[PDB]
Design a binder for this molecule. Structure first.
Ligand SMILES: Nc1ncnc2c1ncn2[C@H]1C[C@H](O)[C@@H](COP(=O)(O)OP(=O)(O)OP(=O)(O)O)O1
Ligand SMILES: Nc1ncnc2c1ncn2[C@H]1C[C@H](O)[C@@H](COP(=O)(O)OP(=O)(O)OP(=O)(O)O)O1
Ligand SMILES: Nc1ccn([C@@H]2O[C@H](COP(=O)(O)OP(=O)(O)OP(=O)(O)O)[C@@H](O)[C@H]2O)c(=O)n1
Ligand SMILES: Nc1ccn([C@@H]2O[C@H](COP(=O)(O)OP(=O)(O)OP(=O)(O)O)[C@@H](O)[C@H]2O)c(=O)n1
Ligand SMILES: [Mg+2]
Ligand SMILES: [Mg+2]
Ligand SMILES: [Zn+2]
Ligand SMILES: [Zn+2]
Lengths: 594, 601
């Protein structure tokens, strides 16, 4: 049976024109082939439970609408030619539209402050309304309901950096009023840690749990952010730095302790530390994080050289944006659109000058697309469909349009700008300059964007959990043996590359700053003092976001351990946890997705 | 653009035939017209002002219905041949029958009333994102109940029943109190605070588009004793040793609910009190008088009346009350409801009552085959691993009815010319009452045969039909026009808004509730003069044989959701802006019902 989609002839012609050129396998690769056939899709899915079915079924169709809607908007704003060009690039694999099934419907991610939740409660829930919390139990509960609300109003992370700032207030209150058995205060704190953590690891996005971030704010950051800001009882938040610190430390100690019982992913843990002139200003917090990380290495290191971007937080945008974790308070991105660099290399045929003209062009096309998507978001807001915006929780003016990049290594390899020696794989000198030029080119267009389109752009070397595959596929499909790589890399140097770590650190030191920390370095791995030194060295080199990776075994009951046998129940290892794309995940789910 | 779906050409030919015989308008009414066009659907949704999270659930419903329709057609063809398969598809699309939750029909089952026993004894091993050990505290127990409701409510189409909630909650209240986890001087707070955490969670949009549908049951002493006979708590103690404890906690919730509404109104959980009643008296009179008293305020509780506990003792033909609104016995559910359009048969019969009854038996027998097919599809999904509720022994297939729904009884008889009026208002004629006796008995016979026929037990229910009551009258009015003067069909033996003496309503429910085995409801719009007067009236109704009933008040609410009576909020002083009313058996915002009803006119 045939089903009609009321597309403009111009679109249907375009789609037709592309289908004839690229063929069906390309549309199949883009998820617009057999996946649009409900009967085929369903009996295919028949091979996670049924609640997943209803989320997965509509994605090809909502993608196809969003593609169409963005095409329409881009044509309105920049003419048919530009609109057609984006669609072709999206389908052929020149660019990767992220969360494309959502792209013309809701935004991507934002790091929230819980302040307005503490102060207004939950008025934006329409099925029922909640007053502001008066107890630790309710406060925790409000966060849970908020993450449920927010994680289905957006595609990406829900960041909760200042969570522990507000939690302490309700610890003090319930302690004041004698709700806690003081003979068991640590159990009480750790119970609310447990209840929150386990809830955030429930399939609240149906197909999976929400993506959430916690931040250990160091003493310097707590001071800068909440300078002058008061608690609901009128007291000053800054007066309780040490109180807020110990609560944070408590959680990190507890989670390290909890993993043996049950291994979990979320929240993603980052420690934000200020570091100047070869030293941590909050050295106490620094040595603490380094110590807790010794067990699982489950906290990412965020390093910054100033706190100016976060002063008195609570038109050009400043503040670190990172998809994995570490994003500053009240910073996000409404959408990412990535540039396939290996594609540009294959197109350039070696001509670095043509590459940089092709690159500069595609970045500008992306900027136009981001500007179109942003217009759609604003439509959806006015249409009453995005209450996160209307209740002042998600802030559009505080969301970047993000220009993504991936496959940096593979691109330079295709250009023939990599090599190997006693220290392993590396870039040639021309290669490093080429990277400087690529990143400099994109930086130029990002800055021009602000004056061009009225909002701030940023740049990120994205995790590319899926794009790293479907792009190498589309390029393989369109260039064959010329594209030898099975997947593209999400770091300056590939994770599984035989190379001295000192080179990895240097490249990150060179280029992390160019993307404003919009990247991550993590190395697969023996003393505490030895470990802490390594951290300082990496920080000296200028690396802005990094972590160390361990192989965490698990059994079918969820016990965390190292080895082949569980030291809890004796059940053998069955799966592994590892930081593959920035956060700790089961390898089995990762490989099966790929 | 054009999109292909891989149907057997036999099905495609069938759909082709039906379209030519009924026209595109028929498919539009069935939700298989413009609704399947994503661009049309989206731009339509985009200017329907609920937020963007709703879009992704509503978008696929026409498509998933189409698949489910196609899958049932296939299975029905495999079990009973193409004629029966074609006969069913035609009957669904034209409106002879109503497939409930049709967008889920080939994917997941309908409803069930669970016991939290396995949750208590095993925790949450079936959640895949993370695993929880058996609870050890009140806080975790509550939090487990919540994860269970989220789990179950998105793997079924209908109600998540929690009859024995207060039985199990109490044990953890006692555990945390003993071990100094709960401060004694704040014993009542910790209890009402977790009443509040659970209840508010249950009114969160956990099903995205809406909150879950949940039920609570006040089990009276007789029911507690019967159900948990010989059953022990985790500490080893007998549950029947703590009947009084369980009762008191239950009373605390009802007292609390009635206390909590003025602060914030809410629908869920839907409240029912199950009471044993024989020979003109309540066997647990203390519980009955309590419920009678508490209800004086909001009338927010439904009365469930039974005359024996034989059907729930120590909890292959299935017995146990199944009711969609609430009151469903522990470990009872339905895997699917398919309703028969009775006014349709009236229109076909032309008045010939013998002809009517022939058509009815046929369509019931057609419905039974459909239920049997769906049940086979469910079993397929289970084995395919898509329905863990079964694998973990929470949802029980053997304990699930196949349901032959009914609707439009009044309107049907009216068309037959078997209704009238007198000094005490609208009522059935003598032959009309006989006719209704024949209709229900006929269906009942076939249901009973179904067990021997199809291997599982069948039940009957005059369903709420919040939507079906509209779309069927629409289709009938489209196919018969002037012959069908009703805008909607009724979900009670006598229409709620029909001027009739209440005693007539009670009589008819007394007569016919037992035929559907309490598979119905009776609610009367109201003030009483005394508590004792109300209690007498409850006993009168219970004498008459009514099995499920309630009284209705018009609960005002302001913009912040405070519950009150009148035009001014006693809490904030803000004016009334909306009402709450039991329209189909549970309390809802009238503005929500009216518009949801309007979005299908
Ligand atoms: N699970 C939940 N989800 C959302 N809101 C909730 C939940 N539980 C409680 N609430 C709401 C109810 C209240 O409007 C609000 C604050 O409740 P709470 O902090 O317990 O104060 P309260 O109004 O209950 O007074 P108290 O509990 O001190 O008697 O939170
Ligand atoms: N919000 C939640 N959702 C799901 N599971 C949870 C939640 N909070 C805690 N759990 C899990 C964690 C445990 O595996 C299990 C039992 O927790 P609980 O009853 O608090 O005892 P416990 O194992 O934490 O011992 P204790 O609390 O006495 O240290 O429930
Ligand atoms: N289970 C996940 C994984 C990732 N993310 C979000 O997506 C980001 C990384 O996405 P990426 O892997 O780059 O996206 P792809 O999978 O390549 O593409 P798509 O947009 O289709 O997911 C994370 O930082 C996070 O904010 C998420 O919400 N949930
Ligand atoms: N918001 C609601 C309303 C009802 N129900 C379930 O559906 C039953 C009543 O459904 P009914 O009104 O008979 O179905 P319709 O809405 O007419 O048809 P459909 O199956 O298409 O919903 C209730 O008892 C309840 O178990 C539900 O899960 N959620
Ligand atoms: Mg605990
Ligand atoms: Mg409270
Ligand atoms: Zn184990
Ligand atoms: Zn009010």
């Amino acid at each position: 049976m045939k089903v009609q989609y009321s597309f403009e002839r111009e679109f249907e012609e375009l789609m037709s024109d592309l289908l004839s050129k690229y063929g069906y396998e390309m549309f199949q690769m883009d998820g617009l082939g057999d996946q649009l056939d409900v009967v085929k899709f369903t009996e295919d899915f028949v091979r996670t439970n049924i609640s997943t079915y209803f989320i997965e079924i509509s994605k090809p169709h909502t993608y196809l609408y969003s593609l169409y809607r963005i095409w329409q908007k881009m044509k309105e704003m920049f003419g048919k030619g530009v609109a057609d060009e984006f669609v072709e690039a999206q389908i052929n694999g020149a660019v990767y539209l992220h969360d494309r099934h959502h792209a013309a419907l809701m935004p991507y991610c934002f790091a929230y402050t819980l302040k307005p939740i503490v102060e207004k409660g939950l008025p934006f829930i329409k099925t029922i309304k909640s007053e502001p919390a008066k107890h630790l139990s309710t406060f925790i509960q409000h966060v849970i309901q908020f993450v449920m609300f927010a994680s289905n109003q957006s595609s990406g992370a829900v960041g909760l950096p200042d969570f522990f700032v507000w939690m302490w207030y309700f610890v003090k209150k319930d302690l004041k009023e004698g709700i806690i058995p003081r003979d068991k205060l640590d159990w009480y704190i750790e119970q609310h840690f447990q209840i929150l953590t386990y809830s955030l690891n429930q399939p609240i996005r149906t197909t999976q749990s929400p993506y959430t971030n916690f931040t250990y704010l160091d003493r310097n950051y707590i001071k800068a952010i909440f300078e002058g800001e008061r608690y609901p009882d009128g007291s000053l938040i800054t007066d309780h730095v040490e109180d807020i610190i110990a609560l944070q430390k408590h959680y990190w100690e507890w989670v390290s302790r909890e993993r043996e019982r049950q291994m979990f992913t979320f929240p993603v843990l980052t420690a934000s530390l200020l570091y100047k002139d070869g030293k941590f200003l909050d050295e106490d917090s620094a040595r603490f994080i380094n110590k807790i990380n010794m067990k699982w290495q489950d906290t990412n290191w965020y390093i910054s050289d100033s706190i100016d971007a976060v002063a008195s937080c609570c038109e050009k945008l400043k503040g670190r944006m990172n998809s994995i974790g570490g994003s500053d308070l009240n910073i996000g991105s409404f959408k990412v659109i990535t540039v396939n660099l290996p594609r540009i290399a294959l197109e350039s045929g070696g001509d670095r000058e043509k590459y940089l003209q092709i690159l500069r062009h595609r970045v500008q096309l992306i900027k136009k697309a981001l500007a179109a998507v942003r217009e759609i978001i604003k439509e959806r807001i006015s249409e009453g469909l995005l209450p996160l915006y209307e209740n002042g929780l998600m802030l559009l003016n505080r969301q970047y349009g993000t220009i993504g990049v991936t496959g940096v290594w593979e691109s330079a390899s295709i250009m023939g700008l990599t090599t190997e020696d006693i220290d392993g794989l590396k870039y040639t000198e021309e290669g490093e300059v080429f990277v400087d030029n690529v990143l400099d080119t994109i930086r130029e267009e990002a800055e021009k964007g602000y004056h061009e389109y009225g909002f701030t752009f940023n740049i990120e070397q994205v995790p590319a959990e899926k794009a790293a595959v479907t792009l190498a596929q589309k390029d393989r499909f369109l260039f064959g043996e010329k594209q030898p790589f099975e997947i593209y890399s999400n770091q300056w140097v590939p994770l599984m590359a035989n190379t001295d770590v000192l080179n990895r650190i240097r490249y990150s030191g060179k280029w992390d700053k160019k993307v404003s920390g919009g990247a991550i370095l993590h190395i697969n791995l023996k003393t505490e003092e030895e470990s802490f030194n390594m951290v300082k060295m990496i920080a000296d080199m200028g690396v802005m976001y990094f972590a160390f990776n361990t192989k965490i075994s698990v059994c079918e009951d969820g016990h965390a351990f190292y080895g082949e046998r569980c030291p809890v129940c004796g059940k053998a290892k069955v799966d592994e946890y590892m930081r593959i794309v920035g956060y700790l995940v089961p390898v089995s789910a990762f490989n099966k997705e790929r």
